[PDB]
Chains A and B, each alone.
Chain A
Amino acid sequence: SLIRGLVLDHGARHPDMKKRVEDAYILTCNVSLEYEKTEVNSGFFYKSAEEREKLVKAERKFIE
């Protein structure tokens, strides 16, 4: 097939997002809405205890 535009291979992981799009204002964002759902941040790793209780609250937030 000949696609005058492009083809991405993914719908992210969620179907029916209104994945059929006639008017597409394209946000290509190399940064995630998935940083992580757990306590510690995406790149921030801690095996010390007191430093982990610090990130648990706003990790789920900085997503939203």
Chain B
Amino acid sequence: VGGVLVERTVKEVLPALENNKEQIQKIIETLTQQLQAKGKELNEFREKHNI
């Protein structure tokens, strides 16, 4: 860490990388997937509203 090198046992250090990466992988699959369909729909939307 920033002003410290924290001493830890594996027992805390091991599961931190376990669940965090896995928890990150869920969220990242969601939005980047949703970004494409937004562009799909926003390409239809932007031609409509701007009169």
Contacts and interface: CB of A to CB of B under 8 A. Distances in A.
B51 to A, nearest CB: 4
B17 to A, nearest CB: 43
Main secondary structure of the interface of A (DSSP, over half): helix
Main secondary structure of the interface of B (DSSP, over half): helix
Interface in B17-51: 46-51
Task: Please tell me the size bucket of the interface on A.
Answer: 10 to 19
A62 to B, nearest CB: 5
A61 interface: yes
A19 B46 CA distance: 41
Contact of A41 (B47, B48, B49, B51): B51
A59 B50 CA distance: 9
